[PDB]
Each structure stands twice: as C-alpha cells, then as structure tokens.
C-alpha cells in the first residue's frame, strides 16, 4: 500500500513544484530560489517551443505538459528501485491508457471508425480505402500507442537487463569489482546510449504524434 | 580592325579572327558559331581573357576585359569544383555554353 | 525564395523574379529546384521549362538548351540557349519534324550525324511534349 | 508439448520485427537524404515519414500480436 | 545526349542544333523571326 | 548541489525498504548514477548565461 | 505431435512478414527521395507508391493466411 | 514424426516469401525513383517493371509451391 | 528420426531462396534506374542484367538443390 | 518441455535485432552520404540521424525485452 | 532437454549478427559514396563513419552476449 | 537424434546462402547503375565486378561447405 | 539430445553468414558506383574497399567461430 501510494504522490509533487513554482515566478522574488527554478520552464519554453506551434500555441502547452510529464515520469522511474521493473512499468502501462486516450480525445472520440480522418486522411492510410486507413490506425495509434508503452518498457527492459546482466556479471565476477567493473562501467554508459536516448525519442514520438494531431487540428 | 591593329603581330598567335565583325548585325548565333569550332581547335586554352569594348553608355565604353578559363581544369579545380556540386560534362558544357554567352555579350558590348 | 533569372540571349523573361521553383529539363534531369539551392550547374536540355512562379503560376516554356546555373543562393539563372515560351511553338511542325527527323536519322550515318538527327528527333519529341 | 511448443513458437514470431526494424531505418534514411536535397522539411516530406513509419510498424504490430498470442 | 555529346560535337553544337531545331520549330512568322537569332554570318577569318 | 544530495538519499531509502537488489546490480547502477553528475557540473556552471540574461531581457 | 507442431510451425510463418515490413520501408523511402527531385506529388509518383505497397504487403497477407491456417 | 514433421516443415518454407516481399518493394521502389527522373513512364520503364516483378514473384511461385507440397 | 528431421531439413533449406528473390529485385531494379539515365536499353545494361539475374538465381538453384536433396 | 523451450524461445527472439543493426547502418549511411551534399551538418540533418538511430533501435529494445522475458 | 536446448538456442542468437554484418557494409558503403562526392575525408564524414560502425556493432554485441549466456 | 538433427542442421546451414544470393544482386546492380554513367565497361568497372562477385559467393561456398559437412 | 543439439546448433550460426555476404555486396557495390564518379580509382575508394570489407567479414569470421565451436 504505502509503497504504491508513496510513488504516485511523489511523481505528482515533483511536477507540482515546477508547476507551482513557475506560477509563483510571475512577480517574486526571485532570490536564488525563484530565478533558479524559472530555468526549468525556460528550458521547456526554450527547447520544446522550438518545435511547438507548429500545431499552434493553443495546443502547445497542453502537449508540453505531457512531454514534460513523460520525461519527468520516466525520471521518476529512474531513481526508485524496486520501481523501474514494476512501478515505472506500471507507469509505462499507466501512461499506456493516457497514450491510447490521447488519440481518443480528438481522433477516436470524434471518429472511432476513421480517427485518421482527423489524423491522416491521405498518407499512410489510403483515402480511397478506409480499410487501409483503419489498419494503419493500428500502426499510428492502437499499435504505436501500445508500442509507445512497449517503447518505455523497452527501455525498462534494456535497463532491467543491464541490471540483471550486471548483477549476473558481478555475480560471475564478484572480484570487487574488479575487471567486471570495466564492462560494467560500459554497461552503465550503455544506460545513457540506450535508455536516455530511446526514452528521449519515446517522448519524441509522443511529441510528433500529438504534433500531427494538433498540427492538422 | 583588330586585323592590322592586331592581326599583324599576333597574326599567328591568333587563334581565329572573325570578320563580319559588325557591318551587318551580329547575334548570339554568331557567338555560338565562333564559339563552337573554337573549341574544336588545337590551340587549347591556356589563360584567356576577353577584351571587347564594354559599352558603358553610348558615350562611353571601356574596353573591357574578362578572364577566359575555358580550360576545364579551372572549372575542374579549386573552390570552383566545390561550387560545382556536379561533373565534368556540364563543366565543359557550360564553360562552353557560357563562353558563348559572354562571347556574345562582350561582342555586343 | 528564388530570384529567377530566366533569359535566352535574345529574350529575357524573368529576371531574378520571385519564382518559387522551376522544374527544369536540364540535360541533367528535370529536377525541381525550388528557391536557393547549392551551387550546381546543370545544363539545360531541351524539354519544357515550367516556372513555378511563387504564386501558383507557372509559365511554360520549352527550353532547348543552355545551362541553368544554380548558385548557392536564391538566384538561379536559366540561361537557356534557347528558351521559348510554349505559346509560339508548333505541333503541325512538331510531328512534321519528327517524321522527317526520324526519316533522316536512318541515313544520318555516323554518331554525330545520327546524333544531329537524334538531337533533333529528341527535340521534336521534346516539342511534342508540349505538343 | 502443450506448454513446450507455445514457448518455442512465441520466439519464432519475434523474427518478424527484424523487418520493421530495418524498414524504419530506411524510411527515416531517405528522409535524411531527401531533406538534404532540401527544403520542404516541415510538411510534405517529414509529414510523409510518419506515413512511412506507420505502414512499416503495421507489420511489426501484426508480428507482435502473434508472439503475444502464444505467450498469453 | 551523348550520341551527340560523345559525338563530341560542340556543346554549342548540340545546343545550337537544339536551338536550331527550335528555330526549326515555331509557328508562322514566329518561325520567320528564327533567322534573327541565326545571325551567324560572321566571316570565317581564322588565323 | 543540495537537490542532488536529497535525490541520492531517497534512492538509498527505497533500496533499504525493498528487498529486491543484488550488491552487484546496485554497485553498477550506482556507478551509473555518479557519471552523469560530473559532466553536468561543468554544464551547471555553463547554463546560467542564457537563462538569467534572457529573463532580464524579456 | 498433431497439436504441438501446429503452435511452433505457425511461428515460423510469421517470419515471412519480415519481407513485407522491410519492403514497405523501401517502397515509401524510394518515394520520399522520388518526390524530393519532385514535383508530381498527387498522381504519377504517389499513385505508383500505392500500387507498390499493395504488391509489398501481398506477401504479408498471404503469409498471414498460411499462419492462421496452422492455428485456426 | 511423419505427420508431425510435415507441420514444422512447410512453416519454415513459408519464410522464403520474405525475399519476394521486399524484392517487390525494391523493384517497384526503383521504378518510383525512376519515373521521377522522367519521362519514359508509359512503356520502357513501367513495362520493364512488369518484367522485374514477375522475375521476383518467380521465386514466390517456387517457394509457395514448396509449402503447398508438404500440406496435401 | 530418419523420416522426421528430413522434413524439417528441407523447409529451412527453402529459406535460402530468400536471397535470390530480393537479389532479383535489386539487380533488375538498378537496371530500372540505369535506363532512367538512358539509353543503353537492349545494348549494355539490359544485357548485363541477364548476367546479373543468372548470378543471383544460381545461388537460388544451389539452394533449391539442397531442398530437393532432403526430399528425394 | 518447460525448462527447455524457454531457451529455444529467447534464441529465436534475438533474430529480431537483425533489423535494428542493419537499419542503423541504413540511416547513418544516409546521413554519411547526405552530409556530403552539404552543408547542414552541425544542425538540421545530423539532428535527424539521432531521431532515426532511435526509431531503428526502438524495435531493438522491444525485441530485446522479449528475449529478457523468456530467460528471467 | 535442459542441457540440450541451450545449444539449439545459443545458435539461433548468432543469426542476430546478420544485421550487424549487413549494417557495417551499408554504413561504410554510403561512406564510400559520400567520400566519392568529396572532400572532407579527414574528419566530418569518415569520422561519422566511426559513429556509424559503433551504433551498428552495438546491436551485434548485445546479440552475441545472449548467445554467450546460453553457452556459458 | 544423432542420425536426425544433422539432417535438420544442413537445412539451417543452407540459410547462409541468402547472403551470397542477395549480395550478388547488390553487386551486379551497382555495376549496372554505374555503367549507366559510362564509359568504363571493360577493364575497369566490370573487371572490379569479377572481384565483387568473388567476395560475395565466398561467403556462400563457405556456407555450401558447412552444409556439405553436415551430410557427407 | 546432448549429441543432437550440437549439430542443430552449428547450422543455426551458419545462417549468420548471410549478413556478411550481403554486406560485402553493398561495400563493393558502392565502390563500383563510387568509381564511376571518378577518378581516384587507386587509393582513397578502392583502398577503403578492403577496409570496408574487413569490418563486414569480421561478423562472419566471428559467427563461423561460434559454428565451429559447437562442432569441435
């Protein structure tokens, strides 16, 4: 109970302080405190606003909240353990429904039979062939939305394997460290090359998909 | 005119000379004419400038000069090849083409 | 954007005019260089030149030859040895020419001559495009 | 035999993601060489790369449905 | 192409054949006007 | 600096409460956790020029 | 034997969708660099892309017809 | 053994259709990147595309006749 | 054993015919882009394409002979 | 039956990485040949090669998680 | 069974090195086509070819790790 | 087992002839798209094609001798 | 089982020679289409042809090392 109950509040609160702190920065103080934190939403309003609108300012902050939430949500599966294999996976699955519903909000909710009528009328889906449209609604949503869960689960995986292989590698070479440290130092750096890149591009998928929504919206 | 004001020195080191140089209106056709075979020559192009009277206004021309670097290793070389961004055909065949244009132009000036 | 410079020695049509794109039957190919575009030289085939003028208008042309010259910049310059607007060209002839052409080629023994015909054939054909 | 062939059969269906894996690198590769020819990046070209990664991961989603049918 | 270009043939020649073929082309008086361009008289002095 | 120290403490507490962790796996991930910081601290200095100036301007 | 080899043999026919998924990234990628040289977007080029992907996923639908005939 | 190995023997011969699947995408894809250079679309190029697609479904007419021999 | 694994040995030998099928498209597709540069059709390139179709379908013949070896 | 088939299930699931490695060679090759045409290297294009080498390895982490599932 | 399926699983994972082998050729081939376009051979383009052989052998070292784990 | 799995081991060794067959299509295709640029037919480009189809079926003779070792 | 699986495991690593044999077809292909661009035939391109066919046959000699280890 406590374990599951403590994690979700923490995730909210880490987003809540930035989401409360930025609202606060609109007049005081700033001292060290307010100006320091302003940089947080300055990085969002710097980085993501280079891509956003795009779809229009209207949707921009709506998506940026999810983009930050995904990266922050994955970051809230970074540190905790046991958590990446379970809680971040339940958060990957807990983001799964939100990812499914993200196409629902405008696509399947307004048009289930052809949410590609909002997403993509002609492209991937054949506008002459509503069948190919709907098939690829899987690959553009029903799928990719579950793969986007699998995508963060891929990271959870490859991250889990670093861990199980690491624990197994250091169980194999329990030298303290020593030569297993060399490989394991690589396996650590592979966490950046794998998870930290692919986790990025996983939210880049949510960025682009919710861009293609609202860019055609 | 360049014919005894110049074809008499370089009356040899000349590659060609053309007549009907004015005295009925010359055109681009002529520039091409004069171009084409010129290529198809045995004096290959080493250096090259085109001197013509560049009109400036009726009142004025200044005998102008250009560089002629038909030599397709000017084109094929340097930054020029880096401004190229596509092979030694069009290289020549522009070097060519442009030569006629200028020839024409220069002439017309 | 592109400053499109469209001229033949004889006629200058657009001159560094804000044309969006020109799709150019360079001997090189038909490519549609829009706006600026790296230095490139492409030699103009005979084909038709389609001047996607930055405005949904496209002027039509036949280009015969010359070179288009692709700066790095925005200004792109078709200097077509011959560039004519399609307006003045002639199907009756295009076919007619083609027939002949095709007749000639056959006796136009030797690559150059054949060529000359062939060029021509090609030409008539390339007129035939538009005609 | 009943719990054996469904555990080795769910592994053979995971060789269908080798097509979508390299098929995603090509559609995003020709978009890297296409935007190199410039300049209609946003809209037209990079808006078609989504239409090319969706028709390629559709066989991937069709292959990941098969391996999960013998696993659950 | 190259059946001419690799007939050598001046690019000018090509061109000029093309262009000439254009001159050859054209309608009516338009085609009259052809000859303008084919000022090409340019006496063949040659040293 | 203070924020980083707090995050490390939290991670330790989670591991101590929950059984599932090998000495090995932890050794590792902990070396992983360390690495990111050092690159960051050179960056953490570098950051400020943009943002504090950008606030001042806007 | 009669039901066991029907679960691990329907998994080997799911590796035949590796050609329909990598081929789709080649039928759309060579259409990305195709419209990059431009300009016939609607009609001619993208119309030939639809008649190409249909002849690419046909070896995916017939391979999923030999897959579902081993399990159903 | 006799009837059991005839089920996991036409399933491994069904993964031979991955060559014809991506081969049809490589053939028709080159024709989409060929008519873009223009203009010999009608005949010459698309007529040769029907010679390349038949010589790629020829391996598909020899691999699907193999799996249909181990069936009935 | 003797009659069983000979049936599952011919099937995996038929998967070696996935190189000839995708080899046939990448050899008759580069000639579909060769005549796009023109004009050696029925001269040099289309003549060498048959000498390219033979070098690739022979690696399909040397693989179908292994599939016929484990069948008779 | 239970202890054995899980070892011959994560072995055939490692044959899905055969696309994540070749597709990365396709995208990083198209960025190697793309930057040759110039000049957007330290922006625009090499920033699209990171977005391509991720989507290719996205079917290389989804396939790797299945081989890590059958083992542990 | 348990000391058997480890040898018929560690071998199937070596078929994951098919993407690492064909990814090394494609990333280097387009580097041989990119340096044929000139001129930044010393760093910039062939330097990125090292950053393309690494992100392609990584999907070949992770596949060779799973094969070594089922053998030792 | 002994007089069985070697008959299904020569089938898996004949899958290595999917690289000697699809490598010939890549080789004898670029020497058809390269001769389209012309005019190095003899002595240069097709001479290097003899040394291109020498290191292509070299992985296939090494794969035809691996199957020959699991038969004779 | 103990003697059976080594034979079935040697052939499975011999299927990893399909990636090295096509990666040599891409490297020597893009050198055959990299020499047509001219003119540094000796050195630069064809000198890096053996340097691109070394890292691509490195995946084959490591794979045929895992195939020989299950045989001896």
Residue numbers in the entry:
A (entry chain W): 10 to 226
B (entry chain G): 111 to 219
C (entry chain H): 15 to 145
D (entry chain P), G (entry chain O), H (entry chain N), I (entry chain M), J (entry chain Q), K (entry chain J), ...: 2 to 73
E (entry chain I): 1 to 47
F (entry chain T): 1 to 58
What does the paper say about this structure?
In addition to the rotor, the F1 and FO regions are linked by a peripheral stalk composed of subunits OSCP, d, F6, and the hydrophilic portion of subunit b.
State 2 could be divided into states 2a, 2b, and 2c, while state 3 could be separated into states 3a and 3b. In comparison, three different sub-states were identified for state 2 and consequently there are three sub-state to sub-state transitions that are possible for this state. Transitions between the three sub-states of state 2 show both motions: the transition between 2a and 2b shows mostly bending of the peripheral stalk near OSCP and F6 subunits, while the 2b and 2c transition shows mostly bending near the membrane-inserted portion of the peripheral stalk (respectively). The transition from state 2a to 2c shows a combined bending at both of these positions. Video 6 illustrates the extent of rotational oscillation predicted from the transition between states 2a and 2c. The difference in rotational position of the c-ring is consistent with the Brownian fluctuations predicted for the generation of a net rotation.
